[model samples]
Target: GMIRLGKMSDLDQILNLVEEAKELMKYPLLEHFEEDIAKDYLYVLEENDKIYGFIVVDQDQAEWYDDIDWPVNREGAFVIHRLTGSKEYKGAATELFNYVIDVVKARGAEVILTDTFALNKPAQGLFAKFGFHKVPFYAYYKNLK
Candidate 1:
């Protein structure tokens, strides 16, 4: 499989991959969710004219990070907002993740941060395999008064 920066022409397939990814994770969202929220901040993976997956990154600006309470501030770090691979490309998740880390490094990011829901065991495993350590604090969230 090949990983590359997303191009405008790859929109449809990329969106499809996003949908498939959500389905695989049992959390499907409405179509255009990523497009509306991440127009210029996503990357995709493909091989032989088929989209294998895509990752949407937050360039350290969005308040979405506040919800997770991660330690990083906006001093030049990239945070992965969402990353999913098609079910058919299951085992390739590691390779795709490493590829995106390379992409972040090439862009001069000092570090990369990502978070998954508390129950996503597979994601936790993947991040661990990629050398990510869990933060000491448990993630906390509540609606504002």
Candidate 2:
């Protein structure tokens, strides 16, 4: 029912929510939770002491340079690496999305960019509703296992 900065105790619950989200979309297995937690901008949503949703945003300008086609400079950009709201918390996804966007803006980032699988209609609609426009780009991945 509320969103807040994540803390050490929230890790297990966050991981559960992530696992559920990935399974729903048939995404490749996520790397260790320790790895994702190391990234600095990740935030979580909590409701009745349970983690319901989370977002992982990279404010690193250089990271954006590699992923985006536009000329983004050190003024910075935010790229949403993961934004998941468990099905049990349905309507909370929109609030989680906006909270992540607000975090980026607070950091002085001008552009916020995120990509969804072409077949993920729900995600695409969410991004569009938040003012993200579809841009030309290709997504490629390699399994390092």
Candidate 3:
């Protein structure tokens, strides 16, 4: 599959791929691409007009990162929020992830930080395979109605 930075025109295709991936996996699918796409933070893997995988990252210091006891200083870090792929795309996810790593590294990022749902072993396993160590942290959310 070919990996490239996502564009505004590709939003529909990327969302379709995310929906298919969410069905295969357990985490909730993203509901919109408005901010990320407009900010140039989305990358996609596609072939023959079909999106197989995608990743969204933030170049700034996201507020949530402050809650984690990261081993290294987070200055110039790229925080990856979502990484997913359709079921049939075996290695596309890894390829897209590695591409982001390279892109960030070349852009002078010192570290990469990301988190996955506690129950998503597939994603955790992939991060482990990529040499990411598990940090002891807990994330909680509350709905303020």
Candidate 4:
């Protein structure tokens, strides 16, 4: 599979992947495909014309956003908003992250940050593997029965 910027045409597939990845987001109903595409923060993993995974990242965190404790505490941080991997292949998530680092570094971003549910062991391990460390979360996390 290969990583690339998402397009409007890819929205349909992206939405499906997002639904399957609900556990990673604070609110499963979150849908930012339009805005994410407009802001050029959306990336996807493609294989044989199908989307296997996708990720959304933003360089600007808006002055009033969550405003929680930040690990980088700088304007150069690129924060991952959402990530979903459908597992068409084992490294769909890892592949997209590699692309993020490649592009972010080339464009001069100083840091990349992302957060997940405390029990998301997969994400925690992935973050550590990518050299990311924990500081805080933008969304208050909770569990539903």
TM-score of each: 0.66, 0.70, 0.79, 0.74
lDDT (tens digit, per residue) of candidate 4 on 4-117: 889988988987776665554553333557778877788888978999888887765545445666534455667676676774554687788777777778786666656664
Against the reference, the lDDT scores of all candidates come to: 0.60, 0.61, 0.67, 0.66
Query: For this target, which candidate reaches the highest TM-score against the unseen true structure?
Result: 3
Which runs in model 4 stand beyond 4 Å of their true positions?
23-31, 62-71, 117-121, 136-145
lDDT of 3 by residue, 1-145 (tens): 3787788778788777766756766623343576778788888898887778888877555577576776676666667777876677757878887887777777776677676642234566676666665554433221111
Tell me which residue pairs clash in candidate 3: none
- CA error at residue 98 for candidate 4, angstroms: 1.0
Residue-level lDDT of model 1, residues 1-145, one tens digit each, is 4776666677677667656655666834544444534466666777887767766665554465555545444466666656666678765556667777777777767667666552234555676566664444333211111
Residue 132 lDDT (model 1)? 60
State the lDDT at 31 in candidate 4. Answer: 55
Displacement of the residue 66 alpha carbon in candidate 2, Å: 3.4
Best by lDDT: 3
Question: Would you list the clashing residue pairs of candidate 4?
Answer: none
Candidate 1 clashes: the total is 0
Better of 1 and 2 by lDDT: 2
Show model 1 residue runs off by greater than 4 Å.
Answer: 22-39, 61-64, 67-74, 117-121, 136-145
When summed lDDT is taken over every stretch of 10 residues in candidate 3, the lowest stretch is: 136-145
Number of clashes recorded per candidate: 0, 1, 0, 0
Candidate 2 lDDT over residue span 1-145, tens digit each: 3787666677777778766766886733344445556654667877788777777767543344465555333344566666777778865667877877676667666676566642233555676577655544432221111
